Structure 1
Amino acid sequence: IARVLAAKAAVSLRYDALAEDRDDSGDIGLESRAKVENRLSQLEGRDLRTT
């Protein structure tokens, strides 16, 4: 998650710094947050122990 979250952090960060007409809404972060949560749920859903 640290790898996934950091990668999305740069995307959300670059849009913050280099956007000429950024709206103070955080939409890019919010959609980015959804992707990380989806990765988290699938990553956590897996169980190493055999069932």
Structure 2
Amino acid sequence: IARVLAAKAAVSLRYDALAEDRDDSGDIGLESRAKVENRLSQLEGRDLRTTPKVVREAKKVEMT
């Protein structure tokens, strides 16, 4: 997230620093924030440990 957040910070910062007619709204920052949150959500949703699956033993059946 630090790598992603730093990249989006530069985009927002460069918009602020080099603007002739920037509106004092932060719209670029807000849209950049949503991208980092989306990156965080999918990244956090990841499960490093493999999920165990439903074991289905074909148990031996003998007639009665």
Please report the TM-score for the alignment, with normalisation by the length of structure 2.
0.79
Alignment gaps of 5+ in structure 2: 52-64
Deviations for 1:9-49, whole angstroms, at most 9, x for unmatched residues?
00000000001000000000000000000000000000011
- Highest RCO, 1 vs 2 (Cα 8 Å, sep ≥ 6): 1
Alignment gaps of 5+ in structure 1: none
Moved over 4 A (4+): none
| Greater Rg over alpha carbons, structure | 2
CA RMSD of aligned residues (A): 0.3
Residues paired across the two proteins, number: 51
Please report the TM-score for the alignment, with normalisation by the length of structure 1.
0.98
Report which of the two has the higher share of helix.
1
